[PDB]
C-alpha cells in the first residue's frame, strides 16, 4: 500500500505552515504494511498542479491525503467537495490572484471526496480530537489540489481514495496576531499530526 | 512561601471543569522553595465565599491564583479587574440566579489584580502559549471569588498577590458541542496546566 | 418577463422567517415590464420539491430567485453552488432529518448559479448593502430548492437564470436569543427586501 | 431639563463615525420639555477631557449620554462600568498610545453608570432593538470620557445621570472590510439614532 500526504509551504504572510511539518514527519514512516510518503507542494497556482501530477505519477499511491492550514478554524475540518474554480482573494505565492477561472475546463463542476470522511470524523472524536465535515475548501490552493487529485483519481484509476483535511493554526502562530488585536483558534501540533495519522488508518481499514 | 491555586467544580451542564483538575495537579507540589496548595471551590454563591475565606485563613498564602473555565475563549485570559456585583445569567449550582447584587456592600466598586499580569502574559508568549489581558471576568463566580480574595488581601494584608486566570475549553469537551451544531475554541489540558505554573513562577520572582 | 421569488416559512423554532414576508411583498409587483411572482415554499423535504416544480410549471419564469434565512450570517450572501446532497443536521418541519442522500440520483454533483452573482454583489455594494459570495448553501432546504431549480433549468430550458440568496436575521428576531445568552447578527427587513429587488434588477439587465 | 449627548469623530482608519452624526442629529431637538444638546468630542486623550469638562460646565446637564462606535459588536451595548485606566492598543488620533495610566490619580478604581441601564435595555427590546449590558468599555477613549463624566457627576453634583452606549458599525462601513476579507456586524443608522432617543426618554422618566 502506498500513501501520499501532502502539506503546503507558508503562504500569505504566515511565517510557518504546520502542514509542511506534518508532510515531513509522516514521510518515510510505515503504518504496518503501508509505506507513507510525505511531500510539501508550493502555494503557487500552476506549479502546485505540476508538482502534484509528477508525484502521483512517480509514487502512484492508493490513498492520497492532502492537508492545509485553515486560519480561524477551531477544529480539524474534513472536506466533502472540491469544485472546479479558482477565485483567489489573495494571490498565490508568486503574485497570481486568479478570479473566476475553471480548474479543468470541461471537467465536472464538482467532486466528492473518496476518503471515508464520517468514519475518520467519528474516530477522531473517540480519540477526543474535535473534528467536523466541511462543505467548502475555499477556491484557492486547497480546493485546487483537492480537485486536481480527485480528477486524476477519476481519469487514471489512482489514487483510489483522495481528500482534503484542514487544520487550525498552531498556538505558536497565535501569539503575534494577539499583537495586532487578534486571537484566532489554535490547536496543538501534536493533535494535528495525530489526527492526520488516525485518518490514514481508517482510510486503510476501508481501502481493502 | 505559600501559594494557593483554586479551580472550580463543573457548572451549568459541563460534564467537566479543567480547573478542578489543575487545582488537584498543583496541590502539594513545590516550585523550589515555595509550597503550592491546590483547592477546588463550589460554583455556589455564598458557599464559595465561605470556603474561600476559611482556606485563606488556614493557609494564609503569599500569592493566591484563582483559575476558571471561560467557555468560547480561545487563549489564556489574564484578568485585570474584579468588580463589586453579581448579575448571574445562569444560576449557580444550587439554583441561585442573583441579579444585580453587591458582593461587599460598602466595599470598593472595583479592585485591580495584584498579579504581575503583563509579565505573566509576556512569559506565556515566549513559552509560545497564546495569552491576553481580559478586562471583564463576568459577574458570576469567577468575578465573585476574584473580588473576595482581592478584598481579603486589602482587609487582612494577605494574600500579597492575588488574581484570576481564565482558561479555554479543553478539546475533549468540544466534541459534544459539535453534536448540537457548535464548535467552540479549545486548548490542550497540558498547555493550560503549564500556563498556570508559568504564572506562579513570575509571581514568585516578583513577590520578593 | 416573468420572475419567481420564493421564501420559506419559519423552521426549527424560529417564530418568523423574513423570506416569507419578502416572497409576499414582491408578489404581484412589476419592475417595469417584468411581472414578479412571490411564493413561500414549505421547509419540508419532498413537499418543497413538489411545490417548487408545480410553480415553475405553472409560471414558467425567466428568472427564478430563491431566498432563505441564513442565521448568524452578517450580510447578504449570494450563493455560488448547489450540490446534489441532503445531510440535514436538524429535521425539516415534518420530522425528517435526512443524512447523506442525493437530491437527484444520477444528476450532476453540482450546479453553479446562473444569476450574474458578482454584478448583483457589486450593485448591492454601491447601494451600501454589505454582500458577499457564499460557496456553500448548507445541505438542508436552501441547497435542496437551490439544486432542484438549477436542475429544472438544465432539464427543461427554463428558468433561464436561477440562484439563491441568504439573508441575516432581522433585529426583532435577535432580541430573544440575547435572552439565552446569545446576540447573533441581524439586518433590517427593509435592507433585505431592497437587496432582493436590486438582485431582480441586475438579473433583468442581463437576461436580455 | 438639559440633556448632553456626545459622539466621536472617526478614529483609527474609519472613514466615518456614526456617533458624530447621532450627536449632530440630536442637537437642538426637544423631547417634550427637555432640551437636548449634541456635541462631538475628539478621539484624543487629554483634549477629549478638556472639551468634555468645558461642555459640562457650560451646559450643566441633568443627564449626560455618551455614545461610541464599538466595531464588531452586533447590538446596542449599554455600559455598566467606567474604570480608572488607559491602556490604549491603538493610538488616539494624535499619535498617543498610553499604556497603563490612571485617568484620575487617587480617584476611585471604578464607577458604575447612573443611567437606568436595565430599563433602557428592556425598552429597546420591546421596540425590537437588540441590546445588552456590556461590562467593559475598553480602556481607550470611550471608557476615558465614560469615567471623566461619572467623576464630574460625583465631584460636582451634575450630571445627575451619566453613562455610555456603544453602537455597532453601520452597513455602509462594512462594505470595504468585505474587501480585505472581513464582514463584521452592522446596524442601520436609523436603529442606532432611535436607540439613543429611546434611552434619553427612559432616563427622563426616571430623573424625576
The answer to whether C195 and C124 have CB atoms below 8 angstroms apart is yes
Asked if the bond preceding B31 is cis, omega within 30° of 0, the reply is no
A89 close to D (CB below 8 A): yes
Using CA atoms, how far apart are residues C32 and C18, in angstroms rounded to an integer? 25
How many angstroms separate the CA atoms of B163 and B112, rounded? 8
C-alpha cell at D119: 430599563
Q: Does A108 touch chain C (CB under 8 A)?
A: yes
DSSP-derived 3-state class of residue A114: coil
Q: How far apart are CA B54 and CA B61, in angstroms?
A: 12
Say which residue the cell 492508493 belongs to: A62
Check CB contact of C97 with chain B, cutoff 8 Å: no
Identify the helix (H) or strand (E) that includes residue D134.
strand D131-134
CA distances from B106 to B85, B102, C90 (A): 12, 9, 51
First to last CA, chain B: 10
Distances D9 to C48, D27, D37, D86, D134 between C-alpha atoms, Å: 50, 15, 16, 19, 22
Cα A112 to Cα A146: distance, rounded to the nearest angstrom:
10
Contacts of A190 in chain B (CB under 8 A): 188
D183–C74: do the CB atoms touch at under 8 Å? Answer: yes
Confirm or reject contact between B98 and chain A (CB < 8 A). Answer: no
Contact yes or no for D199/D167 (Cβ under 8 A): no
CA separation for the pair D83, B198 (Å, rounded): 28
SS3 C162: strand
Alpha helices in B60-136 (DSSP H): 117-126
How far apart (Å, rounded) are the C-alpha atoms in residues C92 and C98? 9
Best residue in B127, B135, B183 to probe A by mutation, most A CBs within 10 Å?
Answer: B183
User: What is the residue extent of each domain of chain B?
Assistant: 1-208
Calpha distance C13→C96 (Å, rounded): 15
C-alpha distances (whole Å) from B68 to each of C80, C89, D50 are 43, 32, 41
Relative to beta strand D110-112, strand D81-83 is antiparallel
Give the integer Cα–Cα distance in Å for D35 and A162: 70
- Chains within contact range of chain B (3+ C-beta pairs < 8 Å): A, C, D
Q: Does the distance separating the beta carbons of C110 and A135 come in below 8 Å? A: no
List all chains that touch chain A, counting a touch as 3 or more CB pairs closer than 8 Å. Answer: B, C, D
What burial letters (b/e) apply to C93-117, b meaning 16+ CB within 10 Å?
beeeebeeeebeeebbbbbbbbbbb
* Cβ proximity of D37 and D27 under 8 Å: yes
With an 8 Å Cβ cutoff, is C89 touching chain B? yes
Cβ of residue B154 closer than 8 Å to a chain D Cβ: no
Helix (H), strand (E) at residue A25: helix A18-25
**Structure determined by:** X-ray
CATH of B1-208, one of 3.40.630.20, 3.30.470.20, 2.40.30.10, 3.10.20.600: 3.40.630.20
Q: How far apart are CA B5 and CA B61, in angstroms?
A: 10
At residue C100, φ and ψ (nearest 5 deg) are 45, 60
A121, three cell numbers: 470524523
- Give chain A's radius of gyration (CA, Å): 16
D191 vs C132, C185, C188: nearest CB: C188
- Across the strands, what pairs with D135? none
Q: Which distant-in-sequence residues (6+ apart) come within 8 Å of B118 by Cβ?
A: B133, D100
CB atoms < 10 A from the CB of A8, how many? 25
Query: Do the chains contact at D128 and C172, CB–CB below 8 Å?
Result: yes
Question: What 8-state DSSP symbol labels residue A42?
Answer: P
Out of B74, B128, B174, closest to residue A183 by CB = B74
Distance of CA B18 to the CA centre of its chain: 11
Q: Which chains touch D (3 or more CB pairs under 8 A)?
A: A, B, C
What resolution in angstroms does the PDB record give?
A: 2.7
Task: Name residues whose C-beta falls within 8 Å of residue D44's C-beta, 6 or more positions apart in sequence.
Answer: D92, D93, D94, D96
Which cell numbers hold the place of B47? 458557599
The 3 state secondary structure assigned to B9-45 is: CCCCCCCCCHHHHHHHHCCCCEECCEEEEEEEECCCC
| Local structure of A112: helix, strand or coil | strand
* Burial tier of A57 (Cβ tally within 10 Å: 0-12, 13-18, 19+): exposed
Contacting D residues, span 180-199, partner chain C, CB-CB under 8 Å: 183-188, 190-191
Q: What element of type H or E holds D203?
A: helix D189-206
Closest CA to C187 of D168, D132, D166, D177: D168
Kindly state whether B105 is in contact with chain C, defined as any CB-CB distance less than 8 angstroms.
Answer: no
Q: Of all helices (H) and strands (E), which one includes residue C194?
A: helix C189-206
CA dist D151 to A11, B42, D159, D160, Å? 50, 37, 10, 11
Alpha-carbon separation of residue A31 from A22, A195, D55, D194 (angstroms): 15, 14, 75, 65
Residue C178: DSSP 8-state: G
Which chain C residues contact residue A110 at CB under 8 A?
Answer: 81, 83, 108-110
| Cα Dmax for chain D | 49
CA pair distance A17, B121, nearest whole angstrom: 25
Q: How many Cα atoms sit within 13 Å of C91 on the Cβ side?
A: 5
Beta carbons of D53 and D153 less than 8 angstroms apart: no
Place of cell 420539491: C49
Q: In Å, how far from its chain's centre is CA A46?
A: 17
Task: Work out the minimum CA distance from B92 to partner chain A, whole angstroms.
Answer: 28
Distance CA C39, CA C19 (A): 10
Amino acid at each position: 500500500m502506498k500513501v501520499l500526504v501532502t502539506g503546503f509551504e507558508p503562504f500569505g504572510g504566515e511565517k510557518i505552515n504546520p502542514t509542511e511539518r506534518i508532510a515531513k514527519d509522516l514521510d518515510g514512516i510505515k503504518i504496518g504494511d503501508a509505506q507513507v510518503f510525505g511531500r510539501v507542494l508550493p502555494v503557487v497556482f500552476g506549479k502546485a498542479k505540476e508538482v502534484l501530477e509528477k508525484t502521483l505519477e512517480e509514487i502512484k499511491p492508493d490513498i492520497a491525503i492532502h492537508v492545509g492550514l485553515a486560519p480561524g478554524r477551531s477544529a480539524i475540518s474534513i472536506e466533502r467537495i472540491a469544485v472546479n474554480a479558482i477565485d483567489a482573494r489573495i494571490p498565490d505565492n508568486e503574485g497570481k490572484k486568479i478570479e473566476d477561472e475553471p480548474i479543468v475546463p470541461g471537467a465536472p463542476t464538482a467532486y466528492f471526496s473518496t476518503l471515508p470522511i464520517k468514519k475518520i470524523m467519528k474516530k477522531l472524536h473517540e480519540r477526543g480530537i474535535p473534528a467536523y465535515i466541511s462543505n467548502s475548501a475555499g477556491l484557492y490552493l486547497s480546493n485546487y489540489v483537492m480537485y486536481l487529485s480527485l480528477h486524476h483519481s477519476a481519469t487514471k484509476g489512482y489514487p483510489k481514495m483522495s481528500g482534503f483535511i484542514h487544520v487550525p493554526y498552531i498556538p505558536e502562530q497565535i501569539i503575534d496576531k494577539i499583537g495586532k488585536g487578534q486571537v484566532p483558534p489554535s490547536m496543538s501540533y501534536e493533535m494535528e499530526l495525530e489526527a492526520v495519522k488516525v485518518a490514514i488508518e481508517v482510510a486503510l481499514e476501508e481501502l481493502l
